[PDB]
Amino acid sequence: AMIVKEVYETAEKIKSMEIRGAGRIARAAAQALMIQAEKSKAKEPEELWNELKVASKILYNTRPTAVSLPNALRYVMHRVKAAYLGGADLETLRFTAINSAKEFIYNSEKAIERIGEIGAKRIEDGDIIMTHCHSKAAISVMKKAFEQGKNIKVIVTETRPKWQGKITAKELASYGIPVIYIVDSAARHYMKMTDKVVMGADSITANGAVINKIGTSLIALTAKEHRVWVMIAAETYKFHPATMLGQLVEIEMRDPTEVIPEEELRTWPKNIEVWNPAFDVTPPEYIDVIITERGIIPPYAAIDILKEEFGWALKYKEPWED
Amino acid sequence: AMIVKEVYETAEKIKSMEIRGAGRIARAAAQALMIQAEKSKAKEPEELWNELKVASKILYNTRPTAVSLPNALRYVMHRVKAAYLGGADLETLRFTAINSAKEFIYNSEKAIERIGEIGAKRIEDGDIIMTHCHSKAAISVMKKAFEQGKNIKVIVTETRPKWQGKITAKELASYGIPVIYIVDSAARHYMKMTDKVVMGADSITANGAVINKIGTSLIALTAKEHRVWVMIAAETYKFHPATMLGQLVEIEMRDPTEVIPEEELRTWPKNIEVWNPAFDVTPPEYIDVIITERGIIPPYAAIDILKEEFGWALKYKEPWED
Amino acid sequence: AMIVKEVYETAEKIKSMEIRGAGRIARAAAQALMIQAEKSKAKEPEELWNELKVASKILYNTRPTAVSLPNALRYVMHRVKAAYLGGADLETLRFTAINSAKEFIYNSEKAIERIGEIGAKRIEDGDIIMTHCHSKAAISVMKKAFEQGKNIKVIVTETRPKWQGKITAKELASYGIPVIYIVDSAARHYMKMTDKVVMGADSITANGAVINKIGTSLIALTAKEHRVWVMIAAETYKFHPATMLGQLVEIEMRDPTEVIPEEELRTWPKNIEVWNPAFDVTPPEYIDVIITERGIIPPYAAIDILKEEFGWALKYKEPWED
Amino acid sequence: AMIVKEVYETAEKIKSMEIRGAGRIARAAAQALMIQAEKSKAKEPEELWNELKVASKILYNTRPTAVSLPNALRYVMHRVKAAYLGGADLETLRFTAINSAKEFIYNSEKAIERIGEIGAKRIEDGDIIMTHCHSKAAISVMKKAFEQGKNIKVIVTETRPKWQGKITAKELASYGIPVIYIVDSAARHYMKMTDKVVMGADSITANGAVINKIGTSLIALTAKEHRVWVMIAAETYKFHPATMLGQLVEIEMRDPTEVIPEEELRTWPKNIEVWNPAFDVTPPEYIDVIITERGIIPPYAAIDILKEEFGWALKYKEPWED
Amino acid sequence: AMIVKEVYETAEKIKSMEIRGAGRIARAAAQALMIQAEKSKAKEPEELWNELKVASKILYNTRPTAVSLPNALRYVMHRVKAAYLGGADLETLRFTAINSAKEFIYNSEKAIERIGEIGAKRIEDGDIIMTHCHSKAAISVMKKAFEQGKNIKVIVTETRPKWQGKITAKELASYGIPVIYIVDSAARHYMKMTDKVVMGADSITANGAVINKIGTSLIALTAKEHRVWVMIAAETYKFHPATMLGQLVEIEMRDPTEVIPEEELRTWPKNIEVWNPAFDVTPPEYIDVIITERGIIPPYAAIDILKEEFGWALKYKEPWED
Amino acid sequence: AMIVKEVYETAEKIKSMEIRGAGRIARAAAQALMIQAEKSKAKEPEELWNELKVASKILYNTRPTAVSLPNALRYVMHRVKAAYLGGADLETLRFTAINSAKEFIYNSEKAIERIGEIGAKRIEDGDIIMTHCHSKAAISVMKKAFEQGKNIKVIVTETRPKWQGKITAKELASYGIPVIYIVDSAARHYMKMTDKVVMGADSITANGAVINKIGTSLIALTAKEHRVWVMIAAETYKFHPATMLGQLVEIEMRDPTEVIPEEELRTWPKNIEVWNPAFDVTPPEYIDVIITERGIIPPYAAIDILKEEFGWALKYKEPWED
Ligand SMILES: Nc1ncnc2c1ncn2[C@@H]1O[C@H](COP(=O)(O)O)[C@@H](O)[C@H]1O
Ligand SMILES: Nc1ncnc2c1ncn2[C@@H]1O[C@H](COP(=O)(O)O)[C@@H](O)[C@H]1O
Ligand SMILES: O=C(COP(=O)(O)O)[C@H](O)[C@H](O)COP(=O)(O)O
Ligand SMILES: O=C(COP(=O)(O)O)[C@H](O)[C@H](O)COP(=O)(O)O
Ligand SMILES: O=C(COP(=O)(O)O)[C@H](O)[C@H](O)COP(=O)(O)O
Ligand SMILES: [K+]
Ligand SMILES: [K+]
Ligand SMILES: [K+]
Ligand SMILES: [K+]
Ligand SMILES: [K+]
Ligand SMILES: [K+]
């Protein structure tokens, strides 16, 4: 029992994609556990422990694909679970949760600035960069490159069905960056004039595969075809612990109405099924580098990032369950 | 100088894409010349000849890329010009136009049917077929395969920006064919479950390359990647004769507002440019077969088709020129 | 309805693969039509017609995959048919069938010796050559080159399940050509030391694909991987005219007992299915040349062989049909 | 110089392949070292040392290719050696050897059951899986996934020349897993209908190459061609430490009579050589993952498995050497 | 007996490469037979027939690789041989040779202008074109493109060992074309900034392979890697008749001193062999188009150019031999 | 301010390529700092420190691309700076420099030897090896393989523009190794007869890419094309640490006159530009192994080498900076 408004409203805003982008989802989730601990009227520590377990279950059960979300939850609740089981009283527990979530948030913010600085060294003056969807990590790189006086242009793919490309196009243009907007279908047509591709990630697997917005794997295919470097800009908390032990990342199937509006789809024949995967999977061979906040790695070093940050927790249960 | 309303109206409708599809555009243009000839008020054959040349020009200057259009005009106008030059009187010239236009129309209808009968033999029971845009020729293949009692399913790509996949989805469904509808970005994600690709063509070049709806070349790339047969259904008048002598096909750049609607687009800053190519070009190494009315060829035999039907004409100027 | 025993024996020996290899099968079918003509006890020219038609159907319904068989029955029966339809009397029909047979049979022998001569020029002193199955056309190339005193070695893949590779190993060893015999699985391992690959063909399609003994496509694939020339030695009567009109070649599935002897298989459980495809299909992009009796072609010129020698016959029914 | 008969029997049964498969061979060598320790009649701790050293050399000189065998002898003898060199007395050495054996033997069994559990997560309901040879690690993956109630089918390649594929077909059929049995040559033909490929390993090198039964590289190659995941199921003790210092793995060449029975071969001429390589080598770029008991790695992380578990031992001589 | 100075001096100037480039060699050879017929002091036709046979033998036996040479010789001597065997008297024979050689020369000149016009349509404004060696055909294309006001730049590879790149670089610069000169080794480094590759040919095979200056096949390899169109500019008389019947083109091995000067090479150890192939062979898959004077073909249509111009003469002896 | 003549002279000789090869340049730079420290007239440690910083800068500003140079300077200067900052007196600082420089030199000599011992194990009896430029590390491999009695032959590419293959040819010949010497353009022509490629490195990046003599990347491309192992012999100090944080390696553009001599070049028009990159970059997918002093790695493990030796240093400024 007993969860605050902010937890529920955040969960609904993740589901509906009013809060979106794997990094932002992650911070939002940490932010929500932070408000539950702030506002909780719990008296006992075991009461609050149980509230935070249940806030965490609600937040995890929103969108499955970007592992940034459970890694945020984990980051807070490994520390909440240790404090609680160590024998922390109420206010010690409240501070552990509140602070762990402030920690993760700040670190996510810092990781992205840093990804931008690292990645922008791989951008050269005159570069035409093609991007996909709307990824804060990818945009940090492009923004920094432009602030360094590299005269760049970005090809923004519209990113059907949900139009994330429109966000990207206005954001980059607002920083002063020349933009070329095209449909997703025009990616091979314009790969010849493209020098660099920069995209984000929702989950990165142990073998180096990249799960990112539907279409990503196509752009990467034709980038390889043309020898255009595919650079994936991605925080360490995009990497997927459980792929270490064989798990496949779930691909989120979103509502048909995102593709065909309700007003039109109801008029269509029964024998047409609309299928709307929100993500696809790009194989490591088509990735040049993964730019984390810890540096440039080849895609196959994803196992090392995981071995050293996340491996230890795979013998344990999730820090929010019974 | 004295041009019937039908010529102008056909022209407006081709430009606007109310009349669309390479094959249909070509028939509409014959038809238009047919009608100018039926309804001409001319008294001398010279006067009719002039109206036909001028109508031909109007029709040519509508859409560049689908060569079926100029080939239709040529079919009619080579015959009209040979009659005029050979001394024909007003009524014999009228008839040569009228009857030439009809022969093209009739031949076009028969060729789409025959293509269906031929391509269908390459479709097998249980096949999943992916297609792109709305191609009458490709549909004839799927439609016939289904009528032969092969249980097929078609993956239809929505085809941005103009949404031609909607036409295709609803049309195939009307015949009883199950459809799976997806965004263009999802073609690689679903290539693994696809057994055949079947698309159409606006122009085929001397070396075997296929100009078709923007996005076609991406679908073929990932099809090759996966060893899925790419079959292009396409009539002999889709073959481009000026490429035998080095010409490159012009790619139509259509209005930004087809991508981002007018309302929205004017709210955007200058430094975003919307680019809307209506076609791309697929190399012959990514085509398994071209299915024409005369049979199955590898794409490299495009030169043979062009030699034995269109080559004779490239010593002469255009049959509508002064 | 009065069919000589030789036709029945021939059909049965084609079925059991006692008579095997695509060219030899073809010659044996012509041979049977020849003996049916010779030994007939037909009063009328219509009684002979009817026997030949019936013998043809029996012979056609033995093994489907190697088009050689029907191209031979065609060669005879096109001529027998045209004779009977110009009102030929009896012994004029009998001789037509007898002399169409001999003519095809002799032209087969000449085409194979000529393929040798043309093919051997692409073999170079020292060459190591890998082959597959037992192909008399492939063997002619290898034998002639050794006769030219080029020092060659042949890698012979054993060719499961029916062990054709043993026939080849002994045949070549009998001309004094050193043989290296290996399992099929070992083709990649030895492809590094291989200089040329030379195989036969059962059917060759209009886009250049080559249907040949199960395994052939695997050898071709790793040959391409290593840039080893794949050379296909194939008479004109291996080219498959029905593929010009969209047809797909059928892949013979032979008895599971060829893989697991009947004694052993009956002891195995029901939930193991044994599948025994006798042919597979190699794409044209992995074939460097086809060596015919008319010359060397790229695989994609199969359509020209077909056009110029068989394309006429497709607009009519099979010559042995009613 | 006093070696118990069990060691000699074990060596001979490893040579004749009555005991086969890389993990089982390893366990049988540890088992033999264990029985030599148990049954020894050695007075001194140096007489036991000397017997174990000698037993080790005998066991090492049976089959070279599967590094499992020496990694097992190492595991025991590193510990037996360190004991004897710290002045251990007799029954302390005997127990060390006895308990190093049991410990390796049990850890082998656990690694294989864990590889099952990790591997099965990458199999999906409906999957068709191709394998090669008979690998207990590969089989554990397949068996566990069927135990999870995923409906799978396994394509089993017969694996010439020694027919290991028969052992696999019966083993899987015995757990109620539908089997499709085919010749090795047919792997490309059925790769289109295959969803996952799962094979074992005899040795795995420092750059990620996988040495496994002859044919394995061919399956991997056409799997890559078709974008079918190739998954290698391999205990840590299959990784080859000497490859870290440049060594190449030796490929066992076994008796020509395994290919052609002795009866038939003696009738064949001298100028046919029969070559029988028992393994081949697959490059890492064709391997999607290696499934170890410690997790899922990209093939290129083989060097980290080696570094962290064996790199120490390379600076000394083999533990059984003088 | 009895050959003029000009025949011998031309033969020596071909050998020494003072006359070079396959087209020019060809015209020079025709020019030489033309002077032998002009200046011959022969009295009988059979005398002159025999002089021209022997002039032709001397000219053929200079450099083997560019088939332009024997096709020039053939073009003259098919016509000389027919006139002579038809019963032509002296002056009829003299005129046949003189005129046939003037014919070939003029046609070669016209073919190159025409290749330039055709090819230049495939060059687009702003194009950076990479070329290799010095090819008149290739230079016609580039020159014409520049005369059309297309603002181009050419990357000229120096073309070791004989520095033909220096000729190319000065010739293009003298017409006004901006040039970038690089070593052969820098071709991949600069393929990313390259839009089009244009090279010539010495011989083109029946299957579409292109034999051209050593290095050509490398540039073509990396052009394919990057999707840069490889366009081969080549007269019909570059196509190689005898590859129709299996012949491999001979690759000319030129003197070691061209690579290492005599003054230096004499000082080098015996165990160093210098190898100097003057040409290599590019496979058809890396060629986009062959631009002949008859139009754009795919590389695989080389067989058609040969079938229709040269096929007929392969049943005959060379028109200069006994 | 007070710099010994040896520092300046070393600097001139590095720029001029009298001292050349990445490994030798690095030793020459340690050596130079060694000598400045031996011969300094300084009295305070501060004065010596300043001379060492200034000499370091002079040495750094010679050639950019081979990172071995800056790594050598760092090895010395990290140790010198830690001593200076930790309060060391004049003589203890002198000694730290002198002895640090010697340790680098000695370690470099030992590492080349060890690389040879390791790489040689990957060379097999009868191997043909192609190499490029003059690499001490690669030569150590070939030299050792030969000394082990493997009959090898080396194809040496001349390496324009500076002709480094001459050095390599004569050096390998001096050991008794047969050499085949070729122009760079001939690498694809001779790749079919090559068994191994063995080249060196100037810099290796975090993602595994190899910067080496211009032309290296072409040889590796066609090697991959042909399944010939590309082995890069290269010391740990060839690994580039600034690439871990996104830096791209600068490619040295050297003087036009190295390509075209001064005499000739001034006779050329303005509108020719000579471009002379001394390096190109080879992607990691085209490298089989890197052979370092610590063993064989796949190229993607470049990050591991960089992490465990150089990563610590990238929080600090350069140890020669103020
Ligand atoms: N759902 C998933 N979860 C994790 N990895 C995946 C998933 N789907 C595909 N992959 C991996 O991503 C790549 C897909 O390659 P392909 O199937 O060849 O497109 C491979 O490296 C797979 O291991
Ligand atoms: N000397 C030659 N004469 C004719 N064709 C050749 C010759 N050498 C190679 N080829 C062809 O050129 C291409 C060479 O491809 P590869 O050997 O894979 O480089 C193939 O299409 C061969 O048929
Ligand atoms: O795939 C998406 C968006 O998914 P959605 O819009 O469906 O959330 C983004 O590229 C990543 O999540 C990374 O973005 P960031 O770098 O901003 O985390
Ligand atoms: O596939 C086979 C034989 O199959 P099978 O044994 O099943 O008939 C041979 O490669 C071809 O028939 C060609 O042989 P030839 O060149 O002798 O026509
Ligand atoms: O290979 C060369 C030169 O060989 P070389 O210099 O050894 O004669 C040229 O590219 C062709 O011969 C075609 O040139 P063109 O188009 O001028 O015929
Ligand atoms: K590009
Ligand atoms: K598929
Ligand atoms: K080979
Ligand atoms: K598949
Ligand atoms: K380019
Ligand atoms: K090779």
mmCIF file of C-alpha atoms in Angstrom, chain C residues 53-186:
data_model
loop_
_atom_site.group_PDB
_atom_site.id
_atom_site.type_symbol
_atom_site.label_atom_id
_atom_site.label_comp_id
_atom_site.label_asym_id
_atom_site.label_seq_id
_atom_site.Cartn_x
_atom_site.Cartn_y
_atom_site.Cartn_z
ATOM 1 C CA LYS C 53 3.543 -39.670 -76.846
ATOM 2 C CA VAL C 54 2.902 -42.344 -74.185
ATOM 3 C CA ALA C 55 6.582 -43.418 -74.030
ATOM 4 C CA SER C 56 7.525 -39.769 -73.669
ATOM 5 C CA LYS C 57 5.137 -39.320 -70.669
ATOM 6 C CA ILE C 58 6.501 -42.408 -69.014
ATOM 7 C CA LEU C 59 10.056 -41.163 -69.491
ATOM 8 C CA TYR C 60 9.246 -37.625 -68.309
ATOM 9 C CA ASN C 61 7.668 -38.974 -65.080
ATOM 10 C CA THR C 62 10.893 -40.569 -63.697
ATOM 11 C CA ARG C 63 13.149 -37.813 -62.311
ATOM 12 C CA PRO C 64 11.996 -34.210 -62.475
ATOM 13 C CA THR C 65 14.951 -32.069 -61.725
ATOM 14 C CA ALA C 66 17.396 -32.454 -64.594
ATOM 15 C CA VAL C 67 15.786 -30.563 -67.544
ATOM 16 C CA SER C 68 18.107 -32.502 -69.904
ATOM 17 C CA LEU C 69 15.559 -35.354 -69.818
ATOM 18 C CA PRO C 70 12.638 -33.261 -71.153
ATOM 19 C CA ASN C 71 14.787 -31.232 -73.571
ATOM 20 C CA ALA C 72 15.738 -34.569 -75.204
ATOM 21 C CA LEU C 73 12.136 -35.828 -75.408
ATOM 22 C CA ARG C 74 11.284 -32.402 -76.832
ATOM 23 C CA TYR C 75 14.010 -32.486 -79.392
ATOM 24 C CA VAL C 76 12.660 -35.729 -80.828
ATOM 25 C CA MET C 77 8.954 -35.087 -80.334
ATOM 26 C CA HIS C 78 8.874 -31.546 -81.840
ATOM 27 C CA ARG C 79 10.086 -33.167 -85.080
ATOM 28 C CA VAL C 80 7.889 -36.297 -84.795
ATOM 29 C CA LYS C 81 4.916 -34.058 -84.079
ATOM 30 C CA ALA C 82 5.552 -31.670 -87.057
ATOM 31 C CA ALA C 83 5.934 -34.692 -89.313
ATOM 32 C CA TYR C 84 2.631 -36.342 -88.208
ATOM 33 C CA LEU C 85 0.803 -32.983 -88.505
ATOM 34 C CA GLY C 86 1.995 -32.520 -92.122
ATOM 35 C CA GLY C 87 0.323 -35.865 -92.853
ATOM 36 C CA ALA C 88 3.483 -37.953 -92.870
ATOM 37 C CA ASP C 89 2.812 -41.635 -93.566
ATOM 38 C CA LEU C 90 4.090 -44.423 -91.309
ATOM 39 C CA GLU C 91 7.758 -45.240 -92.054
ATOM 40 C CA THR C 92 8.393 -41.453 -92.491
ATOM 41 C CA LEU C 93 7.273 -40.883 -88.881
ATOM 42 C CA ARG C 94 9.270 -43.935 -87.668
ATOM 43 C CA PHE C 95 12.403 -42.720 -89.349
ATOM 44 C CA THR C 96 11.823 -39.099 -88.009
ATOM 45 C CA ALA C 97 11.745 -40.405 -84.416
ATOM 46 C CA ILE C 98 14.676 -42.795 -85.048
ATOM 47 C CA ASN C 99 16.789 -39.995 -86.604
ATOM 48 C CA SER C 100 15.859 -37.295 -84.134
ATOM 49 C CA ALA C 101 17.068 -39.687 -81.415
ATOM 50 C CA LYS C 102 20.412 -40.504 -83.066
ATOM 51 C CA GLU C 103 20.942 -36.807 -83.887
ATOM 52 C CA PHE C 104 20.420 -35.636 -80.269
ATOM 53 C CA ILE C 105 22.513 -38.543 -78.971
ATOM 54 C CA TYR C 106 25.454 -37.683 -81.256
ATOM 55 C CA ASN C 107 25.162 -33.924 -80.565
ATOM 56 C CA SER C 108 25.271 -34.668 -76.838
ATOM 57 C CA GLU C 109 28.545 -36.608 -77.268
ATOM 58 C CA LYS C 110 30.008 -33.760 -79.386
ATOM 59 C CA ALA C 111 28.874 -31.016 -77.022
ATOM 60 C CA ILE C 112 30.642 -32.744 -74.099
ATOM 61 C CA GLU C 113 33.931 -33.267 -75.955
ATOM 62 C CA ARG C 114 33.807 -29.610 -77.077
ATOM 63 C CA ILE C 115 33.110 -28.418 -73.488
ATOM 64 C CA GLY C 116 36.253 -30.275 -72.568
ATOM 65 C CA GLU C 117 38.264 -28.342 -75.127
ATOM 66 C CA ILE C 118 36.856 -24.945 -74.276
ATOM 67 C CA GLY C 119 36.999 -25.620 -70.479
ATOM 68 C CA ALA C 120 40.554 -26.967 -70.409
ATOM 69 C CA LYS C 121 41.905 -23.614 -71.629
ATOM 70 C CA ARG C 122 40.870 -22.082 -68.302
ATOM 71 C CA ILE C 123 42.938 -24.645 -66.397
ATOM 72 C CA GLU C 124 46.616 -23.767 -65.897
ATOM 73 C CA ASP C 125 49.651 -25.930 -65.249
ATOM 74 C CA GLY C 126 49.831 -26.847 -61.552
ATOM 75 C CA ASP C 127 46.152 -26.128 -60.885
ATOM 76 C CA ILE C 128 44.372 -27.900 -58.079
ATOM 77 C CA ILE C 129 40.711 -28.380 -58.990
ATOM 78 C CA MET C 130 37.827 -29.157 -56.751
ATOM 79 C CA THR C 131 34.691 -30.839 -58.158
ATOM 80 C CA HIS C 132 31.490 -32.310 -56.739
ATOM 81 C CA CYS C 133 29.325 -35.233 -57.725
ATOM 82 C CA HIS C 134 30.280 -36.957 -61.000
ATOM 83 C CA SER C 135 29.746 -34.798 -64.045
ATOM 84 C CA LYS C 136 30.826 -35.960 -67.511
ATOM 85 C CA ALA C 137 30.999 -32.375 -68.711
ATOM 86 C CA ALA C 138 33.141 -31.340 -65.676
ATOM 87 C CA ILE C 139 35.279 -34.498 -66.187
ATOM 88 C CA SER C 140 35.810 -33.718 -69.877
ATOM 89 C CA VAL C 141 37.386 -30.382 -68.856
ATOM 90 C CA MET C 142 39.669 -32.016 -66.340
ATOM 91 C CA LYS C 143 40.615 -34.929 -68.670
ATOM 92 C CA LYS C 144 41.465 -32.711 -71.635
ATOM 93 C CA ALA C 145 43.646 -30.424 -69.467
ATOM 94 C CA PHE C 146 45.626 -33.459 -68.205
ATOM 95 C CA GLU C 147 45.909 -34.577 -71.841
ATOM 96 C CA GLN C 148 47.458 -31.207 -72.616
ATOM 97 C CA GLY C 149 50.133 -32.214 -70.052
ATOM 98 C CA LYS C 150 49.222 -29.582 -67.465
ATOM 99 C CA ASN C 151 50.005 -31.139 -64.054
ATOM 100 C CA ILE C 152 46.783 -30.972 -62.124
ATOM 101 C CA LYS C 153 45.359 -32.608 -59.056
ATOM 102 C CA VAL C 154 41.660 -33.073 -58.464
ATOM 103 C CA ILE C 155 39.961 -32.717 -55.129
ATOM 104 C CA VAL C 156 36.905 -34.965 -55.242
ATOM 105 C CA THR C 157 34.201 -34.507 -52.648
ATOM 106 C CA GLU C 158 32.609 -37.840 -51.829
ATOM 107 C CA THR C 159 29.102 -36.472 -52.543
ATOM 108 C CA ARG C 160 26.753 -37.967 -50.018
ATOM 109 C CA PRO C 161 24.382 -39.678 -49.841
ATOM 110 C CA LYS C 162 24.709 -41.748 -53.011
ATOM 111 C CA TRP C 163 28.548 -41.593 -53.155
ATOM 112 C CA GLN C 164 28.896 -40.273 -56.715
ATOM 113 C CA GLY C 165 32.319 -38.937 -55.724
ATOM 114 C CA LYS C 166 33.617 -42.493 -55.703
ATOM 115 C CA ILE C 167 32.750 -42.872 -59.428
ATOM 116 C CA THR C 168 34.680 -39.692 -60.143
ATOM 117 C CA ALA C 169 37.726 -40.618 -58.062
ATOM 118 C CA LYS C 170 38.168 -43.888 -59.978
ATOM 119 C CA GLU C 171 37.312 -42.411 -63.325
ATOM 120 C CA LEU C 172 40.045 -39.665 -62.981
ATOM 121 C CA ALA C 173 42.586 -41.935 -61.350
ATOM 122 C CA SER C 174 42.055 -44.252 -64.395
ATOM 123 C CA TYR C 175 43.350 -41.464 -66.759
ATOM 124 C CA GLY C 176 46.424 -40.944 -64.536
ATOM 125 C CA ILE C 177 45.147 -37.736 -62.833
ATOM 126 C CA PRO C 178 46.178 -37.599 -59.144
ATOM 127 C CA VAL C 179 43.070 -37.484 -56.938
ATOM 128 C CA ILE C 180 42.618 -36.126 -53.424
ATOM 129 C CA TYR C 181 39.402 -37.610 -51.956
ATOM 130 C CA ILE C 182 37.656 -35.873 -49.020
ATOM 131 C CA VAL C 183 34.258 -35.629 -47.243
ATOM 132 C CA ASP C 184 31.872 -32.835 -48.411
ATOM 133 C CA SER C 185 32.232 -31.042 -44.985
ATOM 134 C CA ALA C 186 35.926 -30.527 -45.784
#
